[PDB]
């Protein structure tokens, strides 16, 4: 019963944790409503608030026990930090403000609920810390209380009593106060009495230069400084810095003010010491997302109201070209890296029309560009638009290669989109002429490619990239002279280490190199080439990059006898996908090995093994361990409800990765009982679950199946419904 | 979840060999067709084995896939089967290691676990004693699981049809046969078999076999060749298909890893002979790959419904074909709706002025459960919910059950048919996907074999036709039939399951009108001779390599099943004596050339009396002769049965249930035959007499004995040697009298005089 519920409230943390619900101000409530929906007999006990926060408290400490003291059974190099990260922010930032307006300011509680914890814990995380690295070893607990004395939720004394009996800490030294203070440039900590004025102040004299090269701190910039040093914010004053974003965000995009749209997405693109992971961790993506999309959705009507005949035209079409170009580069990244999907968002939203949405084919097939230029995609039974498609081609091909500037006319007549697909349909023609032999002369092409690097081109570098390793695997495979794979680099070297940059494209520049540098860099390293390395080594250490190797970046002398991994999950044979998956029916049936509360291994191993395979090699193997050992945890085999709550343990897990937000179940109870909803979750066990229900029940009237094998799997999918209708998602 | 693909096998000689998964004693069965009375049909008994990794000398593990042989123009005995633990045990039926087997007895090769050779004969299970051998399940997918299995063919060319047209001119329906020569990977004759199989890890194997040595060779590699073993053993590969390609010696490993969620090519490279300068000097086969591309699935349609990957089948596209580029059939449903979108993609090199270029977008109103390639037939079948089947061909992507209603009539070529399923004939109610353990369309498409659950033996549905009752369609009908026949012949096809179609709808034509039925068969047979380009009517020097023909012990035996029902008829007994005939045929002259050698040998080995060779030899001599008394009785005893009928049908020539007599002469090469059988019987008598035996007078008796049978038959042979000869001159001169073809037909298989000639029957 306690291990019942223990069990459900880790697996309830973690998921939520994931699905970023922190900022529901439901998560109290469905906190507390979890001990009555968990035992089906009425249980009303008055739970008090200082009862709730010891719970969320050990429920927090433990859970992340569990996080930290799992990894060292886990593969080496099988690297997923995003959700690491994520404890600390949550840890660190929600849990303190959970207590200033949730509790009563009670520092008994405190010192009672961070006094019950196990030794296991502190041991555990000390000797991790000391492998990995006397120096100074700080735990989480000490960021917790900290939070807490600049908040007055308690005195500097408290801070003592869990100290180190041999080390204390200056009461003095420990700030006490909310309010931002930053360096100015004469050094003396200045009071930010206001927040967004001094965002809106500082990103209107911002300069877009002072990004990647203004690597020293003593910046005269202080909202540059403050991303430079995010890891020190108070904690009530975040939340206020995030709202104090998405108001100036969504008033500029219906007042269509350019210039301070580009500028906040490069800061956001670059997350400087996890400044975008916190970004998410507190605004919902979906809600960033829908903005983000409707600008670039509803950009075609406002082509339609501007004439380009005025001498601030190219200031504001050059505006107008990076605000859009950039606002791309957000959304790849976020679905890159931070597990995103855009065809989700539009579904959600009826307002999106899918069938109309440049932004969500863009992205499906962004590292493969078609062999034909089209102007118009939705229209190719036309052939009027096809003629002046290859003069569009032809035009831009002498005007850059031969004339060498580029002509105002060509620049006003296209639109962007046709853009990001002209570029890489170019230079894909050219650097293939180059490979066979077709084009001889490389000097002429050192210079042509500079012009693909003006503000105004700077959208179509996004899909030159990604072919790049496609075109380079090729390349690694098949045999070329070292005379055309040094012009292959000298052309490459062109776009990676340009001559010059403007002050609109040098961040722009570095920005692009970061998305795909690391399939990149594993086929370079594969063969002028250090440059190449160095310059992507170097663009990749600007800012940490999430479930990569560290080992790999740093290459250049350490040989620890280790093959790299450049994926997130890895494999060897000496721990085959038998081994860990035998583990997994250890865990699956008995809770043995220690892979568990580890969605980050678990949600990729379901993916490469597919939710068939891994339903059916363990629901079909239960029976053989079952007939043979029994139930674990009781010593006499007898009777069904031992087992019952066995199978609740695999039946509630399969539950969460399916239902991910609050009214969304109300809505698969809808579906079982019987369009839109099995759209979103096509990949769900209970859309499977359902197809088979209807297909054998339809065979129940032709009388192909046995009575008795129909009961049989009707008994899995009530037991599915009936945990769902008794449990609120 | 997805069905057995690959759980059974019908091998082209008839054996069903699937997979086995209730009993607890066995794993594999092998059963086959037979026939009950002449009418009907049932499976023979299961013949259970049990297939574990220790049988060179104990827990045996499931069965995967079963391969047979059959690929091309491999003979398709050589069955190869992968468990789920990733052994390859291969199993040679009808060859055992002393002596010469029939096709139900197994026998080993060598085993996989390193590569040994042992050879040995299996037993069957119920036979066997009750051995401690329990079923384990390995329910782990290995590193070494092999996902697709693929066999290796020779240098030999395989000659098909590819369609057939009516001629609107001649009122005739015209087949044209065209050479289909070698593509993709082919081993050479010095190497005894060579296979390939793709493991789910990425390691790939390479079985073979030297023609002039037992021991086995393996050669592995891994497809992502990387300098890292971290990411060697991470290709968990969804989808592997194997499509050979024009390209020489190269396989398109068309792969799906859910690791980089993209559909990835490969390209594999064999060298079969490394140094030709040393043909005595047999290398190993040297094993290269490389990468050449990667794509990104759609999300979306163009209404707006997401889309998601059910299956990935690209066919084995030949270079027959208008574009030869594989057509990569990326499945799509639309969920909650009925539809299900097939993108085809098609890969092709990039030209200057490689890429996947997209064609066209098919939507079909049923979900698809299961997908299988028809070999040498390129139809792609569509195994829907509901049970219904509809076959799209490779040419067009139209439907062959519908094809003639929406067939454009006008042209030159008219009414293209491929198969019977072009006329209408569609299968009934299948069982629901559900309860069935597996499917498989049958070879010829006439009907389905669907293995249940509560069915301790496999079932079987046929194609029915609901205008049965039309009689105008009997002419397309017997015409779609016949042509079915001539593509399962070329590819040595058994084709027992078009033989069951074929009777089914006769016997639905005889219930109602037994007049109609009659006619129905000639017409049918008829369209064969044309198809194959063999003619009943021609000159006699054709008519010699009619009777040493392989068909003829196959389209007289389909008369033989499908007039069976027939009661006191001779459509089946006038096949049958031309049939036996064959096989008295085969009996004299198939001796007298052995014999005639013996004569030879007798005076160049007379140097040597005493050796212990030569009394074998004289031996085996005069005990050859022997055993033709027995064939002989028999021969004497059926030409007295046609002379018995001669006295009969004098009194009463109004006799229709007699009429088989009048058949048995009109046949043109059997006059001949016996003729010739007379011819050899006098020269094997002369050559008794003119060399008989000497050394041994006891031996005589056998060569004594031949001369005695002869002369104490109650007919004279003389005398009736001249009663055939005489019918042939007789026969040939009413020919130029008034030209006809049907007559031909009528003497050698209606057995029976047209009315119009009501005038020749007097004279017999």
Redesign the interface.
Same mark, same amino acid.
């Given at each position: 019963d306690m291990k019942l519920l223990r069990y459900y409230k880790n697996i309830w943390l973690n998921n939520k944790i994931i699905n970023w619900e922190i900022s529901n101000p439901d998560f109290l409530s469905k906190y507390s409503a979890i001990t009555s929906s968990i035992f089906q007999e009425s249980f009303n006990s008055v739970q008090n608030l200082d009862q709730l926060l010891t719970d969320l408290i050990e429920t927090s400490f433990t859970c992340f026990a569990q996080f930290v003291s799992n990894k060292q059974y886990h593969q080496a190099?099988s690297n997923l930090t995003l959700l690491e990260r994520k404890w600390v922010i949550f840890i660190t930032k929600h849990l303190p403000l959970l207590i200033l307006e949730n509790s009563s300011r009670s520092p008994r509680v405190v010192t009672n609920a961070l006094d019950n914890i196990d030794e296991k814990v502190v041991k555990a995380i000390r000797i991790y810390f000391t492998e990995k690295d006397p120096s100074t070893s700080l735990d989480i607990r000490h960021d917790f209380i900290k939070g807490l004395i600049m908040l007055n939720l308690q005195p500097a004394s408290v801070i003592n009593n869990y100290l180190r009996e041999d080390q204390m800490i200056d009461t003095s030294i420990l700030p006490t106060r909310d309010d931002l203070f930053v360096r100015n440039l004469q050094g003396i900590q200045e009071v930010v009495h206001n927040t967004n004025s001094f965002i809106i102040s500082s990103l209107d004299t911002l300069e877009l230069e002072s990004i990647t090269e203004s690597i020293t701190h003593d910046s005269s910039n202080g909202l540059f400084q403050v991303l430079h040093n995010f890891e020190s914010v108070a904690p009530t004053k975040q939340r206020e810095i995030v709202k104090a974003f998405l108001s100036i965000f969504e008033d500029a995009i219906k007042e269509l003010n350019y210039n301070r749209i580009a500028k906040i997405c490069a800061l956001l693109f670059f997350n400087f010491s996890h400044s975008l992971t916190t970004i998410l961790s507190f605004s919902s993506p979906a809600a960033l997302m829908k903005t983000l999309i409707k600008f670039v959705d509803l950009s075609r009507n406002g082509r339609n109201g501007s004439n380009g005949n005025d001498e601030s035209s190219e200031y504001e079409t050059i505006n107008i070209s990076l605000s859009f170009s950039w606002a791309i580069l957000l959304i790849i990244n976020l679905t890159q890296t931070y597990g995103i999907s855009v065809?989700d968002v539009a579904?959600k939203y009826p307002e999106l029309?899918?069938?109309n949405s440049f932004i969500?084919?863009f992205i499906?097939?962004?590292?493969?560009v078609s062999?034909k230029y089209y102007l118009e995609e939705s229209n190719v039974n036309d052939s009027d638009m096809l003629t002046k498609s290859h003069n569009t081609v032809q035009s831009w091909l002498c005007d850059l290669f031969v004339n060498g500037s580029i002509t105002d006319q060509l620049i006003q007549n296209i639109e962007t989109r046709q853009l990001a697909n002209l570029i890489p349909f170019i230079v894909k023609q050219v650097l293939?002429?180059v490979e066979?032999g077709?084009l001889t002369d490389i000097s002429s092409l050192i210079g042509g490619f500079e012009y693909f690097l003006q503000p105004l081109l700077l959208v179509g570098l996004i899909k030159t990239f990604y072919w790049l390793e496609?075109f380079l695997?090729?390349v690694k495979? !098949?045999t070329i002279s070292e005379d055309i794979l040094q012009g292959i680099f000298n052309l490459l070297n062109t776009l990676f280490n340009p001559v010059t940059l403007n002050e609109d494209s040098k961040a722009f520049h570095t920005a692009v190199l970061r998305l795909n540098a690391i399939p990149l860099l594993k086929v370079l390293r594969?063969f002028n080439l250090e440059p190449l390395i160095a310059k992507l080594v170097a663009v990749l250490n600007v800012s940490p990059v999430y479930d990569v190797d560290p080992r790999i970046i740093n290459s250049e002398n350490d040989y620890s006898r280790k093959?790299?991994?450049?994926?997130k999950?890895?494999?060897?044979?000496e721990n085959?996908?038998?081994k860990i998956?035998?583990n997994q029916i250890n865990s699956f049936w008995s809770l043995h090995s220690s892979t568990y509360y580890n969605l980050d291994y678990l949600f990729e191993l379901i993916?490469?093994?597919?939710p068939?395979?891994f339903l059916?090699?363990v629901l079909?193997?239960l029976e053989?361990k079952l007939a043979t050992y029994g139930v674990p945890g009781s010593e006499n085999k007898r009777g069904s409800l031992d087992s019952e709550h066995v199978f609740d343990y695999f039946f509630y897990f399969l539950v969460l990765y399916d239902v991910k937000t609050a009214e969304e179940a109300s809505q698969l109870i809808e579906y079982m009982e019987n369009?839109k909803?099995?759209?979103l979750k096509?990949?769900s066990f209970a859309?499977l679950l359902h197809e088979?229900k209807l297909?054998?029940d339809?065979?129940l009237e032709?009388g192909?199946?046995?009575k008795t094998?129909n009961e049989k799997f009707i008994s899995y999918h009530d037991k599915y419904l009936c945990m769902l209708k008794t449990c609120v998602f | 979840?997805?069905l057995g693909e690959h759980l059974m096998s019908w091998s082209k000689t008839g054996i069903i060999a699937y997979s086995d998964s209730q009993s607890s004693n066995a794993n594999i069965c092998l059963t086959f067709l037979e026939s009950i009375n002449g009418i009907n049909w049932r499976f023979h008994t299961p013949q259970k084995y049990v297939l574990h990794p220790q049988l060179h000398e104990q827990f045996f593990y499931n069965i995967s896939s079963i391969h047979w042989n059959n690929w091309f123009s491999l003979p398709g005995d050589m069955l190869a089967v992968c468990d789920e633990l990733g052994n390859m045990t291969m199993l040679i039926t009808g060859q055992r290691p002393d002596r010469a087997t029939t096709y139900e007895k197994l026998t080993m090769v060598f085993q996989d676990n390193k590569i040994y050779n042992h050879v040995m004969p299996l037993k069957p299970v119920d036979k066997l004693k009750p051995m401690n051998i329990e079923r384990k399940?390995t329910?782990?997918?290995?590193?070494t699981s092999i996902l697709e299995f693929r066999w290796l063919t020779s240098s030999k060319s395989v000659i098909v049809s590819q369609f057939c047209a009516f001629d609107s001119s001649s009122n005739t329906y015209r087949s044209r046969a065209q050479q289909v020569p070698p593509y993709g990977v082919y081993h050479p004759p010095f190497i005894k078999y060579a296979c390939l199989a793709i493991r789910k890890?990425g390691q790939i194997d390479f079985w073979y076999q030297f023609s002039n040595s037992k021991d086995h060779k393996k050669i592995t590699l891994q497809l992502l060749d990387?300098?890292?073993?971290?990411?060697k053993?991470?290709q968990?590969l969804?989808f592997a298909r194997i499509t050979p390609m024009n390209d020489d010696q190269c396989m398109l490993i068309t792969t799906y890893s859910?690791?980089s969620k993209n559909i990835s090519f490969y390209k594999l490279h064999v060298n079969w002979n490394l140094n030709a300068t040393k043909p005595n000097v047999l290398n190993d086969p040297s094993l290269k790959i490389?990468?050449?591309?990667?794509?990104?699935? !759609?999300?979306?349609d !163009?209404?707006?419904?997401?889309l998601?990957l059910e299956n990935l089948h690209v066919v084995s596209k030949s270079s027959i074909e208008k574009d030869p580029s594989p057509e990569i059939l990326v499945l799509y449903n639309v969920?909650?709706?009925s539809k299900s979108l097939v993108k085809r993609y098609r890969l092709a090199p990039?030209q200057?002025s490689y890429?996947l270029?997209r064609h066209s977008d098919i939507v079909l109103d049923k979900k698809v459960t299961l997908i299988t390639s028809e070999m040498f037939d390129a139809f792609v079948s569509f195994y829907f919910?509901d049970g219904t089947i509809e076959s799209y061909n490779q040419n067009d992507w139209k439907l062959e059950t519908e094809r003639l209603i929406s067939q454009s009539q006008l042209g030159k070529f008219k009414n293209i048919i491929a198969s019977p399923l072009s006329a209408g004939f569609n299968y009934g109610k299948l069982?629901?996907?559900?309860?069935?353990e597996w499917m498989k369309v049958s070879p010829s498409m006439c009907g389905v074999i669907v293995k249940?659950?509560?069915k301790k033996w496999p079932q079987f549905y046929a194609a029915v036709q609901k205008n049965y009752a039309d009689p105008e369609k009997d002419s397309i009908n017997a015409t779609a039939l016949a042509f079915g026949y001539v593509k399962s012949l070329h590819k040595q096809i058994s084709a027992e399951d078009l033989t069951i179609a074929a009777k089914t709808h006769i016997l639905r034509i005889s219930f109602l009108d037994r007049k109609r039925a009659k006619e129905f068969i000639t017409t049918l047979l008829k369209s064969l001779y044309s198809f194959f380009n063999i003619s009943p009517d021609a000159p006699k020097e054709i008519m010699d390599k009619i009777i040493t023909s392989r068909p003829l012990q196959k389209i007289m035996l389909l008369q033989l099943e499908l007039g069976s029902c027939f009661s006191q008829e001779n459509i089946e007994e006038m096949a049958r004596v031309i049939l036996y005939l064959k096989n008295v045929l085969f009996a004299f002259n198939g001796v007298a050339r052995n014999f005639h050698f013996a004569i030879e040998q007798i005076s160049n080995n007379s140097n040597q009396q005493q050796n212990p060779k030569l009394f074998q030899t004289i031996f085996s001599k005069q005990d050859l002769i022997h055993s033709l008394i027995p064939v002989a009785k028999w021969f004497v005893k059926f030409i007295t049965y046609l002379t018995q009928e001669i006295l009969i049908l004098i009194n009463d020539p109004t006799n229709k249930e007699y009429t088989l007599v009048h058949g048995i002469f009109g046949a043109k090469m059997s006059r001949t035959l016996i003729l010739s059988i007379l011819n050899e019987i006098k020269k094997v008598t002369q050559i008794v007499a003119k060399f008989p035996e000497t050394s041994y007078p006891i031996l005589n008796e056998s060569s004594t004995f031949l001369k005695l049978v002869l002369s104490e038959s109650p007919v004279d042979f003389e005398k009736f040697e001249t009663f055939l000869v005489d019918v042939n001159n007789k026969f040939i001169a009413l020919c130029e009298q008034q030209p006809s073809q049907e007559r031909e037909f009528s003497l050698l298989v209606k057995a029976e005089i047209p009315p119009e000639y009501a005038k020749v029957g007097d004279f017999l």
């Open positions: 190099n065809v579904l029309s899918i069938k969500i084919n499906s097939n962004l590292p493969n062999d293939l002429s066979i077709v496609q695997s090729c495979n !098949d594969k093959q790299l991994g450049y994926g999950f890895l494999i060897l044979n085959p996908i038998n998956m035998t993916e490469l093994v597919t068939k395979s059916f090699d079909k193997t053989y369009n909803i099995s759209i096509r990949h859309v088979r297909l054998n339809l065979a032709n192909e199946i046995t094998e | 979840m997805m399940q329910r782990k997918e290995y590193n890890n990387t300098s890292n073993q971290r990411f053993d991470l968990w969804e859910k690791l490389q990468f050449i591309l990667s794509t990104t699935l !759609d999300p979306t !163009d209404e707006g419904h997401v998601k969920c909650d709706t990039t200057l890429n270029r919910e069982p629901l996907p559900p309860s069935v249940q659950y509560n």
